[PDB]
Amino acid sequence: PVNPCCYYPCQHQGICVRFGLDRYQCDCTRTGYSGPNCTIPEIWTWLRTTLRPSPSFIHFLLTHGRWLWDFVNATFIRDTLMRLVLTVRSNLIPSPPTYNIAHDYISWESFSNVSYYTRILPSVPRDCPTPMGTKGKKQLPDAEFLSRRFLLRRKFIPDPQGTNLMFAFFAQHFTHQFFKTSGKMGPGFTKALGHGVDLGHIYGDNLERQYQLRLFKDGKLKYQMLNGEVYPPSVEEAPVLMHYPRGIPPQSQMAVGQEVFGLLPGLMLYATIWLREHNRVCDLLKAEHPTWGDEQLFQTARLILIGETIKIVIEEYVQQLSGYFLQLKFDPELLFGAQFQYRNRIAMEFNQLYHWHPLMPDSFRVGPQDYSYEQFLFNTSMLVDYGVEALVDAFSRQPAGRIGGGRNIDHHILHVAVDVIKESRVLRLQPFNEYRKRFGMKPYTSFQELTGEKEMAAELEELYGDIDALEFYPGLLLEKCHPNSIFGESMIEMGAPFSLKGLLGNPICSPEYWKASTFGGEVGFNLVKTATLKKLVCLNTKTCPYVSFHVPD
Amino acid sequence: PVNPCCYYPCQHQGICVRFGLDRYQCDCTRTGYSGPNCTIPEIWTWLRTTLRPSPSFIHFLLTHGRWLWDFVNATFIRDTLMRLVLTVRSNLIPSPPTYNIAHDYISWESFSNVSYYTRILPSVPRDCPTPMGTKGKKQLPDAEFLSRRFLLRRKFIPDPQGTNLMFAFFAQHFTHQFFKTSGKMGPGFTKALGHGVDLGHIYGDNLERQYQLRLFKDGKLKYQMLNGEVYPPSVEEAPVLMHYPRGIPPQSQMAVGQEVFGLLPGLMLYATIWLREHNRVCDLLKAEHPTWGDEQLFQTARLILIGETIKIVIEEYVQQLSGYFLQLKFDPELLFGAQFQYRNRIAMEFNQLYHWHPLMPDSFRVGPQDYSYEQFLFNTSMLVDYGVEALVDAFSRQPAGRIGGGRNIDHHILHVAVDVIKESRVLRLQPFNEYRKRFGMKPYTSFQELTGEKEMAAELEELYGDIDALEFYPGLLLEKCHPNSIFGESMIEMGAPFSLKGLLGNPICSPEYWKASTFGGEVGFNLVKTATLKKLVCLNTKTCPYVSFHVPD
């Protein structure tokens, strides 16, 4: 008796539920639709539906009004739009969370067990005809083939927006504080409990490690003086676990808080900037509150970094990524009148689409030098040799590849990509088209309409057999991109709701926390309010290099 | 240099923060007041303040309109008042949480470490002249004396409202699912993570124990057949830890989920009712969703019990406790338009004031019998001997003592009471008067005005030396009560905001969860919507005894 929920009969977020042996019913509660499968729009939905422009249209308004936008940016409309930009986005993610790899229904376990990642759509019923539901071929395209064929880079296609490597790392670094799939527990589980921008990739994700990195005096953090420059302390003083390859655990083998940050110079680079920043924030506080202790000084600085991060990530990171003339803005008060839940829970579908491995270049220019991957990966002395300053400069000047369009994932890391496709099935994520719907979009009606061409589209149909069978990861990466867009429509529409629900879902964003006392004094607050990328670097360096999320000129 | 925050200079919830060595500043952000210590009311606060009636006045309106209330109860006003009753209450508790026994300021640790209990007011600065701040005697009244003198019962004063023992246990049982101070970690910490009405006192507070009690078939729970009646299974089948005294761990030594529930017949009684209920809910589901599995059937039943509990606790438990003619109501939709955070975190001040030990009688009448404490405590066969039916009857007919007024805590358990006073100081809870303020009330100006008399008032002044030095627990229990009130003004005003923030702060109360699909089908929902005390018992018994939260007649 085909599990009726294999067809995905419920629309607009209606919940499918089997009754009897072969029947089912949709819970169209608050879906704004009624009827058997939630397709009969209520009065306003109907209006909302007809008076609602396409996502692509809006993208165009946002990427064109050279003049119209300097005006709006200069007016209050800026806020109205931001506040609107928020609420609508965030409304698309359930909260409290809903499902996990264990349950495809609401459970007290899914709500309480932080270890699990959460999902937006239930998984594919584990008893459906096809691996994806009902349509498609009995077996999915060999992820090895599918990858080499379409995601493997041939000629490096750089990002039409000027996005650079100084950005690519910040991206990698930053995201790894909530992405930490527990190899031990397996996929769908996370060592990174906290789920937000708690910075458990600096101060570590367990209390000991914090105490291990923590230098218990004036709230600061441990560190070493190589060349007169400050860096993460080595394990020979910070007895904490890492993953440095079997070489020189003594010096050059630094402690950071994110075990894996030894592996690449970019991350250690950032970890250094932050570490050198935190200790810098501590200094300021100790001057303001001399009677303060170590615990405070520390905590107050941790909050000040959770702020500064959320600030930069929104007003600069997303600003550059967007290509918007509307100048994005970070001000928690914008949501104080709305109904918002200050609590985020990283989803697996988020994790999957944040696999921007194609941002990665061919080699790594660093002034006259030009290291290959072989010289760059695991290199444990590049950082301290060059000097943050000099390194920052080198990444802020080298283009980063385009994420979408297809075939742009370098050949080295191309395995990560086959893994995301392989694991994607382990998790049993519904077809691309189902995620299009669930996120307020129309399903593509052909591989033709999906891909901005006809060649790839042909091979695809031949593999998956039907558009409705396409996979989550492969789809996202093969979708046609708006010209001069770092990635396609779906990437923008699907991930923004996850990103903002996260950034603003942080407790420090709530009315309760957002006071000047939380960052001890007015000094803490202003730091969170005026944080910049340029300031994060040039404040913690000797010389002011060239830092930005886009190549100069 | 006296820690300036020892005087408690900040008003209306303004945050005190030391600057320099001997200075300080108040963060009157969103306190509705401005100025040095937050005493200059903004425009509306001033109005809100003048057009605001006293708590005692309102209590009178709520406990008098015999006619006016049958009307209001019969109209929509009922909802308007409930919805108003809620929001205003819940607004008084910070959310996300704020402090713990470790930090007297906002910290990412306090937000993330569930192990800690949270506090409303910061603790007493650990460096102030007096143990309570500035006023009072260098040392506090011997908690042994203070207890015997005022909290020790002389003549048993029953509850003017007809509250019975069938209530006293439900109260004890129910509260112990969020109150579990970790003896091991000490005071201010809790084994009961979850913090809400998660029922971790049935299904246990760890996954194993759940699996230990869990009979992995049709979602039900393990159990034994004594007399043909269903009871918790014994440890000789449910390998889970308990605290039964060194006697017969084999039979009569039952497994429940709350280790300590073996100690008294009342709790085991309730645990039985619930356990026999859950397995009862499972039956219904299995009929509706025959294709369902064990995990679901189980989880769906757990949610159905979290509902039914929140229902009864509000519409019956608090209804009886209140003495209100306004008929309280449980409907999550009442808050869907408001700004509410669906997340609760048990506070230590809540824990302290939920110590209703004086509810406990002198002996325990059970028909013709009349067990003393010595025969009642630890009795491991009273339950199965008598039969739930017969036992329920016996508690629903025996008056429960009055909680307030002073001197009504039986002599046996009088130690618990000295402990709460002893630990209260370990935690360093601010003086009674500070908690009066923080909860929108006027501090008492004399022991005279506090206590509904002059005798006790005299001895008190002589001990504490000043009203402003009185303690949290002793105050609450010695405060004058409105005639025919189970307890005083402060108990009502301070604890309601904690109780409701809790009950409604449950994720199942959120828009996201409150759908009929969450309780699988319409059957689950209606069960949560029509749950009663009478139904919880008489549905899971052979004969329908007399059950209620107040003595018959």
Ligand SMILES: *[C@@H]1O[C@H](CO)[C@@H](O[C@@H]2O[C@H](CO)[C@@H](O[C@@H]3O[C@H](CO[C@@H]4O[C@H](CO)[C@@H](O)[C@H](O)[C@@H]4O)[C@@H](O)[C@H](O)[C@@H]3O)[C@H](O)[C@H]2NC(C)=O)[C@H](O)[C@H]1NC(C)=O
């Ligand atoms: C919520 O918070 C509580 C309380 O903070 C957590 O429990 C507590 O955790 C800490 C560390 O995990 C335990 O540490 C204690 O401290 C001594 C002192 O350490 C010594 O001095 C420094 C410290 O780094 C080092 O240089 C030395 O090498 C050495 O380590 C430590 O030695 C002991 O191990 C001792 O336990 C603390 O005791 C512990 N217990 C409590 C409850 O207070 C709790 O884990 C956390 N909850 C969660 C799950 O996150």
Ligand SMILES: *[C@@H]1O[C@H](CO)[C@@H](O[C@@H]2O[C@H](CO)[C@@H](O[C@@H]3O[C@H](CO[C@@H]4O[C@H](CO)[C@@H](O)[C@H](O)[C@@H]4O)[C@@H](O)[C@H](O)[C@@H]3O)[C@H](O)[C@H]2NC(C)=O)[C@H](O)[C@H]1NC(C)=O
């Ligand atoms: C969030 O959820 C995860 C996943 O559920 C938790 O981790 C998992 O926890 C369970 C139990 O704690 C582990 O149990 C496994 O099951 C076997 C089978 O048990 C046997 O059969 C029954 C079961 O009760 C009994 O009659 C037998 O005596 C016997 O126990 C068990 O034997 C093994 O111990 C095995 O571990 C599961 O393996 C474990 N691992 C994961 C991640 O899947 C996780 O704790 C939870 N997070 C938190 C902190 O709450």
Ligand code: HEM
């Ligand atoms: C130097 C280039 C990079 C290399 C060599 C690299 C390598 C890897 C490897 C080996 C894995 C583990 C296996 C897997 O899950 O497939 C992984 C996971 C991941 N990478 Fe990268 N990566 C790189 C850059 C990036 C960047 C720039 C981002 C961010 C936009 C990124 C985001 C991720 C995420 C989100 C994961 C999954 C983490 C998890 O396990 O939950 N990576 N990467």
Ligand code: HEM
């Ligand atoms: C038969 C009568 C009772 C006895 C013998 C009893 C005994 C105890 C004992 C020995 C403790 C541990 C020591 C302490 O913390 O002081 C305790 C704690 C407590 N009791 Fe009772 N109690 C009884 C009834 C009740 C009732 C009716 C309630 C609820 C209104 C209640 C609520 C509590 C709470 C909230 C705690 C603190 C739990 C914690 O440790 O966090 N008790 N009781």
Ligand SMILES: CC[C@H](CO)NC(=O)Cc1c(C)n(C(=O)c2ccc(Cl)cc2)c2ccc(OC)cc12
């Ligand atoms: C103006 C509303 C519109 C809604 O779609 N745009 C926005 O909300 C802005 C917006 C947000 C918030 N982005 C994200 O942070 C994001 C991060 C990671 C992933 Cl994987 C996906 C998205 C954008 C990424 C790209 C973009 O243009 C090309 C816009 C946005």
Ligand SMILES: CC[C@H](CO)NC(=O)Cc1c(C)n(C(=O)c2ccc(Cl)cc2)c2ccc(OC)cc12
């Ligand atoms: C009508 C508003 C007014 C506000 O104070 N009353 C209410 O909100 C009703 C109200 C709530 C919610 N109670 C609690 O559950 C509660 C439970 C444990 C503790 Cl330790 C303290 C309070 C009452 C307890 C007693 C009472 O009269 C005597 C009213 C209430």
Ligand SMILES: *[C@@H]1O[C@H](CO)[C@@H](O[C@@H]2O[C@H](CO)[C@@H](O)[C@H](O)[C@H]2NC(C)=O)[C@H](O)[C@H]1NC(C)=O
């Ligand atoms: C690790 O990085 C260092 C650079 O910091 C590499 O050494 C440099 O190699 C280039 C040529 O590849 C020389 O011209 C530089 O003078 C070297 N720097 C010095 C003095 O060490 C090193 O080869 C890298 N190791 C790996 C992993 O290949």
Ligand SMILES: *[C@@H]1O[C@H](CO)[C@@H](O[C@@H]2O[C@H](CO)[C@@H](O)[C@H](O)[C@H]2NC(C)=O)[C@H](O)[C@H]1NC(C)=O
């Ligand atoms: C535990 O409770 C039982 C009742 O279930 C007590 O036994 C009863 O005691 C009374 C007099 O105290 C007798 O009249 C009943 O007939 C007894 N019931 C039977 C047949 O066992 C028992 O004494 C209690 N034990 C303790 C802890 O004192």
Ligand SMILES: *[C@@H]1O[C@H](CO)[C@@H](O[C@H]2O[C@H](CO)[C@@H](O)[C@H](O)[C@H]2NC(C)=O)[C@H](O)[C@H]1NC(C)=O
């Ligand atoms: C709701 O969705 C189901 C899913 O297919 C629709 O399908 C049923 O009815 C169709 C036309 O009558 C048939 O093509 C399907 O075989 C049949 N399948 C199922 C799941 O029963 C169903 O009609 C939809 N409801 C309506 C009336 O719109």
Ligand SMILES: *[C@@H]1O[C@H](CO)[C@@H](O[C@H]2O[C@H](CO)[C@@H](O)[C@H](O)[C@H]2NC(C)=O)[C@H](O)[C@H]1NC(C)=O
């Ligand atoms: C704010 O509260 C403080 C706490 O006492 C007030 O007290 C200061 O000033 C009083 C009168 O000038 C003195 O009696 C106190 O010694 C003094 N103590 C401190 C803490 O400095 C203070 O005046 C209040 N602010 C105002 C002006 O209302």
